[PDB]
Amino acid sequence: ETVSFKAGDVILYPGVPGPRDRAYRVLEGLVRLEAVDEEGNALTLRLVRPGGFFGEEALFGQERIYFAEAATDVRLEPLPENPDPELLKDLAQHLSQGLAEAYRRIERLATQRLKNRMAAALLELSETPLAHEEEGKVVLKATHDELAAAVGSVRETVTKVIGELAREGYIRSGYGKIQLLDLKGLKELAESRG
Amino acid sequence: ETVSFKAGDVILYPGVPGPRDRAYRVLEGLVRLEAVDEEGNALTLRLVRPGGFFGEEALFGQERIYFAEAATDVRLEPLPENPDPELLKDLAQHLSQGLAEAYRRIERLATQRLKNRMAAALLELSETPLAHEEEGKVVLKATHDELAAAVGSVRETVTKVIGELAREGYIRSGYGKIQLLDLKGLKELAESRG
């Protein structure tokens, strides 16, 4: 069986999973897992690309501490309540990869300057359906508030970092989009603590 | 089959897993997964308690970006190269829980003050074999350098935070140990952004 969601639609809500809640495997599109505070602002916890899994806590009775939102139009595949061996192995493989990527995020938050973390965030997003190319340059669809959620910062600080990256020539910014001009330069920032 | 390691022994090294590398399930003791930089200093990525799993990347040919060290004497159970369904489900359950805990760590690093994160770190460690009780108070075996690795900070900043917590009466510190005096107070700090 398969289920579809339009960009912006809420797929899962935080809390103790309901008895018929299901985990999902992404077939197409991008899913964003995020923590939302009492003021309605978010912190992106993980991006799930095609082939990835989320909502796994429903298989184990574990509390869901995040919202699962459709970043783009998505087509999902609900997992059975009792995944067979091969599906379970694929789930485990992806949870292992996800945990390692979370480790990398922890490393960045603990040791990397915001400007450098933003460069990494921009490159990461450039590998998703939220980006494409215009005039031969990668163009990302992302507002400053979304970028703030991506690097775990606030609008003002992000706006200042984006402005500096723009003035230096790494990117161009406007109309809810970011155009990447110097990919090699951004990669160098992303790989440095700053 | 079962294997044992003494406190301080390296269980796994970072890099591409060897063809006979195995994942492990902890039977007794505490295992610490940590990232180590070029200067030999660490950032703790995850603590694995009895029943937990680590080294899972060996099951999937994924690069290991951490060292697996025996925090205390440990007894481990190597997983077969092809875990049966029930073992695989337990592994997945623990990777899911581990990922959720990583999400919480990301939230703390992005929104919580160091003093408050230290309170959380102290309480977390108090639930492991690294702690016990003396004079009716929890006493944690942890040097300032280890605490720095636990909260992703540096020795100096940790020393100052520990000194303030001590002067205020939350803890007592000395001889590589931390004595928790006000558990309720520490919990309040741990649950607040600061």
From Swiss-Prot, chains A, B:
Molecular functions per Gene Ontology: DNA binding; DNA-binding transcription activator activity; protein homodimerization activity
Residue ranges flagged as DNA-binding region: 144-163
Family matches, as InterPro entries: cNMP-bd_dom, cNMP-bd_dom_sf, Env_Response_Regulators, HTH_CRP, RmlC-like_jellyroll, WH-like_DNA-bd_sf, WH_DNA-bd_sf
Biological process annotations from GO: positive regulation of DNA-templated transcription; response to oxidative stress
Pfam families noted in UniProt: cNMP_binding, HTH_Crp_2
Superkingdom, taxonomy of origin: Bacteria
Disruption phenotype: Viable, but has growth defects, particularly when grown in a synthetic medium. Increased sensitivity to disulfide stress. Decreased expression of TTHA0986, TTHA0770, TTHA0337, TTHA1028, TTHA0654, TTHA0655, TTHA0769, TTHA0425, TTHA0634, TTHA0635, TTHA0636, TTHA0637, TTHA0638, TTHA0570, TTHA0030, TTHA0460, TTHB243, TTHA1128, TTHA0035, TTHA0520 and TTHA1803 genes.
Span of domain HTH crp-type: 112-184
Keywords noted in UniProt: DNA-binding, Transcription, Transcription regulation
Gene3D superfamilies registered for this protein in UniProt: Jelly Rolls, Winged helix-like DNA-binding domain superfamily/Winged helix DNA-binding domain
CDD domains: CAP_ED (cd00038)
Induction: Increased expression during the stationary phase when grown at 70 degrees Celsius. Increased expression during the logarithmic growth phase in oxidative stress and upon treatment with diamide. Increased expression by heavy metal ion, antibiotic, high salt and organic solvent stresses.
GO CC field: cytosol
Subunit structure: Homodimer.
Main function: Activates transcription. The consensus DNA-binding site of this transcriptional regulator is 5'-WWGTGAN(5-7)ACACWW-3' in which W is A or T and N is G, A, T or C. Regulated genes include those encoding proteins involved in nutrient and energy supply, redox control and polyadenylation of mRNA.
Record protein name field: Transcriptional regulator SdrP
Species in which this protein is naturally found: Thermus thermophilus (strain ATCC 27634 / DSM 579 / HB8)
